[PDB]
Amino acid sequence: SVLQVLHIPDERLRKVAKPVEEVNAEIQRIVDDMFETMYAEEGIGLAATQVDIHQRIIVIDVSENRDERLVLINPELLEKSGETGIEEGCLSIPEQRALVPRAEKVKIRALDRDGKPFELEADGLLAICIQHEMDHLVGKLFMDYLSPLKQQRIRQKVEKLDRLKAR
Ligand SMILES: [Cl-]
Ligand code: NI
């Protein structure tokens, strides 16, 4: 099923996710719904926080052909290096953008969809998306990296867009 994605200024987006205790049937269903939602929204990543489920679960697909599913359950950042930054969007901040400074390279450990442990070294867009999505799990949004005036403008624009969509 496609789930609702929360938009700013919803306070539930600021909630710090708890670790997943056991990757079970419930967790696998959440993962599958998150993929359905991410693809339906034409996004490249989604955190459980964004769908009002406050557990450390991320789904990602940065591929052009939309056929490279990555699941991070309980991800932990092991190392980071380099400097990068692109214009980022966010499904929770619809249609908005900002240049966000990030690490170019990250190494993480996590559990996959079957609950099997793995490690991953990532760079380029994948590394940027991992960091963006991991931020969500600690209640942090790309807005938080910006000036107060820019944050105000972004909030106002999302609020107007949401009124318009609310039909
Ligand atoms: Cl997002
Ligand atoms: Ni986001």
Curated annotation (Swiss-Prot):
Cofactors required: Fe(2+); Zn(2+)
GO biological process: co-translational protein modification; translation
Cofactor note: Upon overproduction is isolated with 1 Fe(2+) ion per monomer, a Ni(2+)-bound form is as active while a Zn(2+)-bound form is inactive.
Active site (UniProt): E133
InterPro entries, A to Z: Peptide_deformylase (IPR023635), Peptide_deformylase_sf (IPR036821)
Pfam families, A to Z: Pep_deformylase (PF01327)
Catalytic activity entry: N-terminal N-formyl-L-methionyl-[peptide] + H2O = N-terminal L-methionyl-[peptide] + formate
Keyword Iron attached: yes
GO cellular component annotations of the record: cytosol
CDD domains: Pep_deformylase
UniProt keyword ATP-binding, yes or no: no
Superkingdom in the source lineage: Bacteria
Subunit structure: Monomer.
Role of this protein: Removes the formyl group from the N-terminal Met of newly synthesized proteins. Requires at least a dipeptide for an efficient rate of reaction. N-terminal L-methionine is a prerequisite for activity but the enzyme has broad specificity at other positions.
Protein name: Peptide deformylase
Organism: Escherichia coli (strain K12)
Lineage of the organism: Bacteria, Pseudomonadati, Pseudomonadota, Gammaproteobacteria, Enterobacterales
